[PDB]
Design a protein around this ligand. Structure first.
Ligand SMILES: Nc1ncnc2c1ncn2[C@@H]1O[C@H](COP(=O)(O)OP(=O)(O)O[C@@H]2O[C@H]([C@H](O)CO)[C@@H](O)[C@H](O)[C@@H]2O)[C@@H](O)[C@H]1O
Ligand SMILES: [Zn+2]
Lengths: 427, 255
């Protein structure tokens, strides 16, 4: 449920697994082995199969296919604590594996990884899933400890062992690792080599028997940002590199345009997850706003690219049906950003008209409610203000005539034009 | 200047706005906003239209983007701000009004020096990484927001992120090595020093750059600059010797 609770319970988990390492003399108790059986059976016959699948190493990453984890988080955490007191470290490490991705969203991966380190020190024989090893690279990158993250990723790719009943599983891990290595080079500003690593991660994802669309989406989005930061010389070298055979490169002649195309593919490979559609098309709209006002845009093509920017921001605004909840600050901001991006496109096409000013006023109003959201603490507020900025966003779509698109797939947040991909990615 | 010449200076015509959105030479921007006067203070607890201005040391161009900025409360003079194009959307940012009577051109020159310092931080951090040194100098220049009413410039605020035994090397050794590196990497024309002295760090491998000052052989614009005197004083009083980082990055003594 709450960030601060999970931290407090994960910290004890660690401090007690630290004591078991010293105290040792595995003198459990009948109350310990009972309370383990106690807490594991409360787990809904559902999470229990998940723990078993994770126990026996069915995948290196938990499949997405969670509300399961979010609901049973309190139970999971109690069973984790009891599994540890019973010195059942395989079940504890399976539970850590299962809550890992959800707890990254809670900003408590640090405490979780301290539990994972404590289980491994208590008995080095315990598996520890690649996802959890990679997680410690992720928070090292987020911290600016870039060398440490590389060491982690290196030790994962070679050298107290986890193994894969599959060959593709090993290349999936290497692809995610290579992706994060690309993000490291990106943090440092080494745009070209970042893009080579991000490209390698994409080739890998595409080589899987079933291509990892999540990975392709997030690598295409990283590639888009790298294209935006690239020098024109960086982009020319990458474009004429005989080892890169990406349709983005051959089909376009400007790094902003390849960036906007990479964002369109990122959104499509994420067509069912509306938050990453919105994120991707906002970057797409920004690229096209930048390109269409640059001296590189043919004057006769200016209107065309601005209408592409228009369409992108609109898709973003359409990722949420009218009166439907929005929870996080990031998604709230992204929504205000798409509304002002749409308003800006109309401004660039038509100047300061009555409808541009009215829309601009609406964006300021939403901006105020968004800042009130980001400076609140009581949950009633965050829920009530979020409604208010979403109420204003709905006003903006109605005011600027945001036409819904129809797509054959009922649950795709991306138009049919976006979805031409996969075989068309590498030509 | 007449009243009309001040009205023309504070009003971005569509042609002006088009140049700004494409990218504009530093000399052109300084000329275009020199005779603006003092802009009034902006209303707090309110959202405003703004032009985000970014300078690029590579292209030597200022590029404008339209954005929206909320100006919040005074910090218990600095105030909270939140704008749609801010780098860390979950972070908090702090704005200050620019109302010095010496003119807007001093503020833009200041931000160009900060981009020049930041350019050397980036290159230095790449060299640290290449040599397997687990530390980065952290530095982020302020951004300029031009508050607009319609096409009329109403205000100018400077925005900054709210940021308030590792061993091997001490923060001062990193800071002086950065200054030595900035002298080699600029081909013996610039030296960057911290006016605060690398006192601050954090719980990581981050050493903070707070107040960069660039002693330079070149002079351009009206920035106060110790020039060649500063460079000699650096290599003879502040970085008299050289440390292990200087040696790992293969820096040599000059004159
Ligand atoms: N479609 C997306 N577009 C943009 N960004 C996205 C998208 N999806 C997630 N992100 C963000 O990327 C960060 C790590 O996301 P996770 O926490 O889920 O990583 P995790 O190791 O558990 O899962 C693995 O993730 C791999 C992905 O390539 C990420 O490496 C897959 O290739 C593997 O198949 C396996 O699913 C996090 O900030 C998340 O918000
Ligand atoms: Zn030296």
């Amino acid at each position: 449920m709450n960030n601060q609770k999970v931290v407090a319970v994960l910290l004890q988990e660690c401090k007690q697994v630290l004591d078991q390492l010293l105290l040792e003399a595995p003198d459990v108790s009948e109350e310990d082995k009972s309370e383990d059986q106690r807490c594991r059976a409360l787990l809904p016959s559902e999470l229990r199969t998940l723990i078993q699948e994770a126990k026996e190493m069915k995948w290196p990453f938990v499949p997405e296919k969670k509300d399961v984890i979010g609901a049973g988080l309190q139970q999971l955490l109690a069973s984790l604590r009891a599994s540890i007191l019973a010195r059942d470290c395989a079940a504890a490490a399976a539970i850590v594996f299962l809550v890992d991705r959800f707890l990254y969203g809670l900003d408590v991966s640090g405490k979780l990884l301290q539990v994972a380190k404590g289980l491994h020190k208590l008995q080095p024989a315990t598996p520890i899933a690649p996802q959890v090893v990679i997680r410690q690279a992720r928070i090292s990158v987020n911290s600016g400890k870039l060398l440490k993250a590389e060491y982690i990723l290196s030790s994962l790719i070679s050298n107290g062992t986890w193994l894969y009943r599959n060959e593709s599983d090993k290349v999936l891990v290497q692809s995610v690792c290579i992706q994060i290595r690309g993000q490291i080079l990106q943090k440092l500003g080494m745009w070209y080599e970042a893009a080579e690593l991000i490209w390698a991660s994409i080739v890998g994802y595409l080589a899987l028997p079933q291509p990892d669309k999540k990975g392709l989406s997030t690598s295409l989005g990283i590639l888009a940002d790298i294209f935006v930061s690239m020098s024109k010389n960086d982009y020319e070298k990458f474009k004429n590199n005989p080892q890169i055979n990406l349709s983005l490169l051959k089909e376009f002649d400007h790094h902003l345009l390849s960036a906007a195309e990479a964002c369109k593919l990122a959104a499509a490979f994420s067509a069912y997850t509306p938050l990453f559609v919105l994120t991707a098309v906002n970057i797409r709209g920004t690229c096209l706003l930048s390109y269409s006002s640059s001296n590189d845009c043919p004057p006769e093509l200016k209107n065309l690219h601005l209408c592409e920017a228009k369409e992108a921001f609109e898709i973003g605004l359409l990722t949420k049906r009218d009166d439907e909840p929005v929870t996080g600050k990031q998604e709230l901001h992204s929504f205000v950003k798409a509304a002002f991006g749409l308003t800006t496109v109309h401004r660039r096409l038509h100047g300061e008209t009555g409808t541009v000013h009215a829309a601009s006023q609406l964006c300021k109003e939403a901006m105020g409610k968004l800042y009130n959201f980001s400076t609140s603490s009581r949950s009633q507020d965050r829920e009530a203000l979020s409604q208010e900025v979403m109420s204003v966003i709905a006003q903006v779509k109605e005011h600027l005539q945001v036409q819904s698109f129809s797509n054959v797939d009922d649950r795709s947040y991306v138009p049919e034009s976006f979805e031409c991909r996969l075989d068309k990615l590498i030509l | 200047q007449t009243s009309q010449e001040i009205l023309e200076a504070r009003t971005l015509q569509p042609d002006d706005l088009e140049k700004l959105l494409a990218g504009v030479r530093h000399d052109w921007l300084l000329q275009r906003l020199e005779n603006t006067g003092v802009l009034k203070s902006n209303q707090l607890q309110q959202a405003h239209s703004a032009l985000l201005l970014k300078y690029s040391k590579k292209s030597e161009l200022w590029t404008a983007q339209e954005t929206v900025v909320y100006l919040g409360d005074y910090l218990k003079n600095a105030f909270w701000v939140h704008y749609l194009h801010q780098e860390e959307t979950l972070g908090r940012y702090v704005g200050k009004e620019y109302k010095e009577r010496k003119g807007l051109r001093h503020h833009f020159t200041d931000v160009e020096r900060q981009m020049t310092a930041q350019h050397y931080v980036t290159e230095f951090n790449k060299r640290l990484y290449e040599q397997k040194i687990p530390t980065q100098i952290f530095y982020v220049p302020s951004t300029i927001l031009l508050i607009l009413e319609d096409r009329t410039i109403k205000g100018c605020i400077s925005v900054e992120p709210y940021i308030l035994v590792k061993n091997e090397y001490k923060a001062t050794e990193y800071g002086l090595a950065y200054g030595h590196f900035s002298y080699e990497f600029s081909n013996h024309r610039d030296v960057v020093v911290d006016l605060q002295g690398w006192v601050t760090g954090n719980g990581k491998g981050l050493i903070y750059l707070t107040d960069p000052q660039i002693h330079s052989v070149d002079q351009k614009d009206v920035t106060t600059n110790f020039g060649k005197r500063g460079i000699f004083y650096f290599f003879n009083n502040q970085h008299a010797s050289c440390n292990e980082i200087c040696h790992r990055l293969s820096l040599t003594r000059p004159s």
